[PDB]
Structure formats: C-alpha cells, structure tokens
Amino acid sequence: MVTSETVVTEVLGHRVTLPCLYSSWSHNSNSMCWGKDQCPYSGCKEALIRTDGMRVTSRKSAKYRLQGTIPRGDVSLTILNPSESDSGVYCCRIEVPGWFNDVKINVRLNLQRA
Amino acid sequence: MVTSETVVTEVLGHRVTLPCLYSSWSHNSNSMCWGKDQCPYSGCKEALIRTDGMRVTSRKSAKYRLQGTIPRGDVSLTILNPSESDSGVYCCRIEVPGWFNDVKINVRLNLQRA
Amino acid sequence: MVTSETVVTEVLGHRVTLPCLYSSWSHNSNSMCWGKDQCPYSGCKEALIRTDGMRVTSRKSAKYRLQGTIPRGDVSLTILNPSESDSGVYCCRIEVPGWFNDVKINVRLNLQRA
Amino acid sequence: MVTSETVVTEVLGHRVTLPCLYSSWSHNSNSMCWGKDQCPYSGCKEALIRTDGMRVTSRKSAKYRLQGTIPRGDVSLTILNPSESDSGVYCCRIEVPGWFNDVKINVRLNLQRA
Amino acid sequence: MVTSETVVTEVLGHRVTLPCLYSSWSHNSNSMCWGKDQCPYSGCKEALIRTDGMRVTSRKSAKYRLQGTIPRGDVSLTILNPSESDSGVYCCRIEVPGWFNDVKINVRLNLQRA
Amino acid sequence: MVTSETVVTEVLGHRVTLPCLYSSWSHNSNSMCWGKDQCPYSGCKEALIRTDGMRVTSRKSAKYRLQGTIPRGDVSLTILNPSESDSGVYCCRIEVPGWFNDVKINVRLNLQRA
Amino acid sequence: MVTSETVVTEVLGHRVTLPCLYSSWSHNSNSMCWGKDQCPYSGCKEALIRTDGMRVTSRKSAKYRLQGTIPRGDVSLTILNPSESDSGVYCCRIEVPGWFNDVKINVRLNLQR
Amino acid sequence: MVTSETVVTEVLGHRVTLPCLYSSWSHNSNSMCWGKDQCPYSGCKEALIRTDGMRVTSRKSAKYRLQGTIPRGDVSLTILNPSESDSGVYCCRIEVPGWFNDVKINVRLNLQRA
C-alpha cells in the first residue's frame, strides 16, 4: 500500500521538532499521542508522550516535549538533545471520537552531522 | 529542513514498484536517474538505473527496471525479486534544464514477509 | 468512519448509469467488479459483473452492462430497465496490483415514480 | 440527476454522530432541522429535531441530541443507543433568509454488527 | 436564490463572442442550444441556435454562429454585426443524458459604442 | 472583456439582500459604498449608501440598509420594501489604502412577482 | 496596486529560458510577443520577438528564440548568450480576440556572476 | 531556478507597504528582518529593519516601519516618503528554528511619478 510521510532532516546538538498539526482540533473531542516505529494503539496507552485535548498528561520527560499550542491542534513533538539513535519513523496519532476515525500522521527523523 | 516522501509498504516474493511521475516531461529536455539512500549527484552518473529523454541507458540490470512509459514521464522504479535488504529510502532525480531546476522525489520502501 | 458517495436519482424504467472512473487504468494490470450493498472481496468473485482490464469476463446479464471504454478506466455500471429492487448502494471495486492497493467507490441509486 | 452525500459507517452499542456543519451560521439569521429519508419541508416542522439560532427547540425523542456548538453552525446529529433500524439516509436542512436559499445536506448511516 | 453568471463587456463594430465551454463533451451523448433572456426548455427547440453532438443543426443564421470546436465542447456563441438590442442575458443549455442532468450557464452581454 | 457577477433571484414583498463580503476587512484601513448600474467613483461620493470602516456614514436612505457586521467585512446590501425598479445591476466598492487597490464586486438583482 | 510575477534566477554562460505558457492557445485566434521593461502595445509591433499563432513571424534573431511548441501555447522565451545587461523585467503579451482580453505575464530575470 | 514574487506599484511620495505574512508565527520561535536586493544572512545582523518575535528590535529608522501585528506574523514593511532610490527588489526573511528552515519572501517595489 502506498501512503505518505513527512521527512525532517536535521543536525545534532539542538532540540529538534517533528511537525504534527490537526487544525480542526477541539479540546472537547480530541486527544493525541506519539509513538516510535509504530503508531500507539487506540486509547494511547503505551506512548512516548500523550495529551488530553488541552495539555500533556504524560509524566514530565527529560527527552520529550510538546511546545506548541495544543488546543489549536499543534501537537508537534520536540525531542531534546537528540542523538543518532533518535533517527527513524515516528507516528502521531490524533484521537477522534467514533469508529476508526483516528488520524495517523507519520514523520521520519533523519539526523546528520553538520 | 522538512520535505515529504512516499511510503511503499509491500510484501516479498513479487516485484514492487516505487512511484515517480513527472507530468511536465518532454524527451528533448528532461532526463532521470534513481539512487538508494541519497539522490545521485548532478548529471545522474553513478545511479541504480539511468535514462536520457527516451530510454534506459545504463546496462540491462536484472534487479532494476522501468516498466512505465518514460517519454510520458513515468519513471517509476520496478524492483524484481526484492529481499529485505532492498527496504530503505530511494531517490528519483528528474533533470530539468537550467540552474538548480532539478526535481528530487523520495520514496521509502518497506518490505514485509506476510 | 466517514466517507463519501455519489447519489444517482433517476426514474423507474429508464436505463441508468452509475459513474465509476479510474483514470490510471491499464489493460495489463487492472481489473474490476461491481457489487450490491457491499464491494465484492478481492478476486472479484460473486459479483454483479466483472472484468479483466479489456472487457467484461462475466457471462452476460440482461440487467447489467459496462458500456464505457473499459481499457481507459470508465467502468461505470449501466442497469437496464431498473426496478424498485434495484435501488440501493452499489460498490465499484478497482483491483490494483500489490498489497492493499484496491480502490472502492460507492454509488447509491435512488429510483423515483413519475 | 447526480448529487453527493457523506457516509457514516459505525458500530452498534455506542452513540453515533452524523456530521452537518454550516460555518456562516448566525443565531440572528439561521435555524435548522433533521429528517429521515427525505429532508423536512421549509419551516422545519415534522422533524426528528429542530433548532432556532441558538439551541434545540423540540425533538421527537430523547434519542436525538445536538451536542455540537450550535451558534457556530455545528448542528451534527447524535443518535443515542442506535439499533439496525436507525440505518438509512438522513437529511440536514439549514434554513437561510430569502427565497429558495435553504441548504440540504445528506448523510447515510450504516450500522454494522459483530 | 443566488447563482452566478459571466459578464461580457464589449464594443460594437465587430462580431463578439459569448463563452460556453463544456469540457466533458462527447458527440455521442451531448448536444446544446442558446437562448436569450432564458435557456430554451428541455429538447432545445425554439432557440437562437442549436446543435447535436457534432455540429449546428438549426438553419444557417446571418446573426448566430458557432465558430468554436463543438466536438470538444466549445459551444461559445458568435454574434455577427451586433447592435445595442443584442445586449442582455444569454443562457447556454448543455443537454446531458438522464433525468435533470442538463447544465445551464449564463452570460450577460454589455455592448458599448465605437 | 470577461468578468463575473453574482445573480440574486428573489420575490417582491419582502426585504432582499445583495451579498458583498470582504473577509480581510479592517476598520482602520477599509471603507465601502454601493452603487446602482456602476460602482461609485473613487471616494464613494454619491452612492446608494456608504460606510467609514465601522458603520454607515451616509445615505441610509430609507430603502437602503447595511445590517450585516461591517467591522467583519459583511457589507451586504439590504433593500427594504423592494419594487420592480430595484431590479438591475449593483456594484459594491471596497476602498483599500494605496494606489488602485479598490475592489469592485458586482451583483445583478432579479425581482419576480410573489 | 499589487500584482505578481515569476522570477528566473540563472547563471551566465548558457542560454536561459523565461517561462510563458497559455494553455488555452489556438492557432486561429492567439498570437504573441515579448517585450523588455514593459509589455509591447496591442498589435505585437515591435517586441523582442513575435508570432502569428503558429510560428515566429518577426525577423530571425541571433539573441532571441522561441524553442517551445508554439501551437500548444508554450511561448517561453529563450535568450542566447546572456550578459548582465539582459537582467530585468520581461513581459509576455498573449493576444486574445475581442476587447481588452489580452493577457500579460511578467518574468524577472536575475543573472549572477 | 524559478520562483515568484509580489509586485507593488505605487506613486513616489506616498507611504507604501510591502506585504510579508507568516501565519505560523510564534513569538517563542520566530524572528525576521528585511533586506534590499538580497535577503540578510541567517541571524539578521545587518538588514533594513529587524524583530525578535514581538516587536522591532533594530534602532528606529525614519524610513522603515513595521506597522502590522508582528506576533500574528504580519511583518509587512512600511516605507515612509519613498524616493526613486527606494524602487527595486526587497527580501523578507522569516527565521525558523532548526536547519535550513528559513523562509525567503520577495517583493518588488515599482515607484511611478506623480
């Protein structure tokens, strides 16, 4: 099957950001989580980071951060002080009410030397 | 910098194709080549496969084939008897006349066993 | 899950056509079948009507016909002398080579009286 | 004649929602109603549910709910405890000032078992 | 009710053209006619000018001409030796098979002196 | 030369509205006026009705009213107690700072009996 | 007043091309000419170069050539042996039958050292 | 390489604004500067004028002004009493965190005589 994904090509030494925007976001209905390699399953249990529709509900992490305006659907992932092992495919799962309405948006991180 | 790429998720044992289309194609002006991991450098010289404006000019490779119609801009890469080592990023470079007009189109291949 | 479909509103007894177009069609690789209520499963068995990429390979219906240019991807369904039992949802399944590449297109037929 | 409609494919046992959005909505000018199979006539009486510019003013049953933010034009229909008989075509009628300006928006609900 | 129309602002003294293009045109199914003030009724009888799928079938007119390529759907109206009385609203009726599939496209002509 | 316009087809006996929306409107920079047959000249002098960017500043005639939200760019014209002589072409002129930046928006009104 | 134009940033030493496409082109009705700084006046006389709707009708020039397929509306301008003085705004005037129907398309050429 | 730019045509002696809008602007992340003929380099340390994401941080110029709301991304340039030497190409550089994410936006100013 053929799908599409975003590619972020970056340099080591500063935090990097993986874009995920869901413009129609509403704090009343939506929530979100990030996973590596694969999308977290429905109900966002086993994720890198997670939100409720307003803010991060995940325990505070040294690595993972959401620095965008979450109530407007800017759930972009910030990865602090990245290393080469952080390279690879990430999945942003937007939770949508109802049956099989979730949106999965993929971002590939490619870290290289300046 | 952020770009985008096509993802092809496929199964082993049959030929797979990585889509690459250049609608504006004209045989007198355009040319093309394919590369793995990275785009070949300007002048498409050490690539997986290469064409002029009409046809494949590099050898006759058992693994790599272009089965689409090149003069109409269908330069999709076909890979015969693919194995797991064939997974990864491929790059399709459309050569366009002039200064920095070349088009680079990326496709990530993911092969599963099923 | 949320999708979309075309609705064809016609009068009982008049031949009707349910639109289904696949612009990218190739006589070498594509095929198709139509189903009522649900799309036929892959391999288009037990269908209203079916093709190979050139022509209808199904026997012949007094009712069902493909009158468009099948090798150019116009696999629109024509229904002769439709009756009230012919109202309802139809599904046009385009068979595409590879893993989960098939396209499903829905058309709802609504027949009226006078 | 050919029109288009959205299809909502859902599972039994939980409330389902049928989208109907009118962005230009104003509590001063607009009102709305929902009907089954056919759109309610002008003046939105004999309906499943109906509003003024702000809120629901009458419903045929507690089964039907408008839970979106209505003054912003989200008059999407929620159906509580849906059963198989709830499947079929629904029509959302937006009332607009002037002569023949009403908007009719159709949604087909498909409830599945298993 | 609100619709839209094209406006042609022109000068007297040379033939003028009112655009009407129907890209989907096919000589096997489509035909057309022009009317002044209103589109002619279905079946395009007592019209300014009329065609079948290929060509003008109404008597040759000293005033009205179709100079575009009709089999490709260019059924734009040419008006020879225009005078001020030629100003006003025109309607281009595309005849399409089936129930209420005809398309009406309106053009208002405003002719000026010199 | 070819342009386009909105057509409002309405009935006598009730107020009618002619649409003119300018979304980028700002009370600090924009103003507007309506004219019959032609847009009023630059400076909107002797128009049907005119505003200063916030509200109508001249010629709320009797007939002519602006009931939309002017600061949000809804400068749609309401004509109270319309008669047949009110049919015809109207022009909405949006005044914009700088050289020849004004926008002209045309609406043709067609009034029918009742 | 605010309009738009395409920008061609190129390098010296090879012929350069300024795009101008009119998809709707038909040889019976359309014709075309190019001008520098400003559009040539109606009646494409004179331009750097001009056509009749099929092919170039102006004298054959050493500097200016139209290498696209003109009957399909590819009236892009090719400039042979460009120098810095060739930089600036160019205007492609597509002639269309009737009153004030002509299309003007602007391209700015920027040549670098 | 081929890009596009906005053209502003104004009359000498009148203040002009050169549009530059960046919708995604955030006071936390973005900064900007304007240059003539060419974009200022990364880090905007010469330029015509510059901001820190909230306001102009370059010392006040008699010529150059940013009068739009900078925190919403309107970094349009206002030039007071422009003279003939002010004609020409301008470049608006939006600075974005990470590697090669800066956006370059061009405006050509054309000043005409009174």
Author numbering:
A (entry chain C), B (entry chain H), C (entry chain F), D (entry chain B), E (entry chain A), F (entry chain E), ...: -1 to 112
G (entry chain G): -1 to 111
Publication text:
TIM family proteins exhibit a classical type I membrane protein structure with an N-terminal immunoglobulin variable Ig-like (Ig V) domain, a heavily O-linked-glycosylated mucin-like domain (MLD) and a short C-terminal cytoplasmic tail. Recent studies indicate that hTIM-1, with some other but not all phosphatidylserine (PS) binding receptors, functions as a common attachment factor for a range of enveloped viruses, including filoviruses, flaviviruses, HIV, etc., through direct interaction with PS of the viral envelope. The Ig V domains of hTIM-1 and hTIM-4, exhibit two antiparallel β sheets with the front and back faces formed by A, G, F, C, C′, C″ and B, E, D strands respectively. A hydrophobic cleft formed by CC’ and FG loops, located at an equivalent position in hTIM-1 and hTIM-4 structures represents the putative PS ligand binding site.
We crystallized the Ig V domains of hTIM-1 and hTIM-4 and determined the structures at a resolution of 1.3 Å and 2.3 Å, respectively, using the molecular replacement method. While hTIM-1 has only one molecule in the asymmetric unit, there are eight molecules of essentially the same structure present in the asymmetric unit of hTIM-4. A striking structural observation that was confirmed by sequence analysis indicates that the Ig V domains of hTIM-1 and hTIM-4 share similarity with the N-terminal immunoglobulin-like domain of sialecsialo adhesin 1 (SnD1), hTIM-1 and hTIM-4 could be superimposed over the structure of SnD1 with an r.m.s. deviation of 2.3 Å and 2.2 Å, respectively. Residues known to interact with PS, including WFND of the FG loop, are conserved among hTIM-1, mTIM-1, hTIM-4 and mTIM-4. As to hTIM-4 and mTIM-4, three extra residues from the BC loop fill in the gap between the FG and BC loop. Results of binding assays performed using SPR showed that amongst the proteins tested only hTIM-1 Ig V could bind EBOV GP. A series of chimeras of hTIM-1 that binds EBOV GP and hTIM-4 that does not bind EBOV GP, where corresponding structural elements were exchanged, were generated to map the region(s) that are important for Ebola GP binding. As expected, the T14 (BC-CC’-FG) chimera showed the most dramatic loss in binding activity to GP, whilst the T41 (BC-CC’-FG) chimera restored the binding activity to GP. In agreement with hTIM-1 chimeras, the T41 (BC-CC’) and T41 (CC’-FG) chimeras gained some ability of binding to GP, but with a lower affinity of 73 and 208 μmol/L, respectively. Expression levels of hTIM-1, hTIM-4, mTIM-1 and mTIM-4 on the cell surface were close by transient transfection of the indicated amounts of a TIM-expressing plasmid, but hTIM-1 enhanced EBOV pseudovirus entry significantly greater than hTIM-4 and mTIM-4 (>3-fold when transfected with 0.5 μg).
